[PDB]
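TL;DR need structure tokens for one chain.
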Amino acid sequence: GNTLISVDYEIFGKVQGVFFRKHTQAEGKKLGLVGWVQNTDRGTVQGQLQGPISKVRHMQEWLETRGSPKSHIDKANFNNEKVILKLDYSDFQIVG
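>> reply
TL;DR here they are.
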């Protein structure tokens, strides 16, 4: 059992109408992460990532430069980066 972290994310850019949520869920699962992703009312994509630090950090880089193939990302805001006792999530859902 490694040090587990959680981080909140919000992604600004051409991120809706580009299958962003599907590809986020897929990549999170590929990297062994749990959490969630949704569209927000301000046109951004938002969620949390939880998992081992190297895995979360990789997904953070994904969210900074890549996302779904047709998306382009202006900014990824991260906050509430915290060490956690255990995962709060058992899967990675698209929730909104």
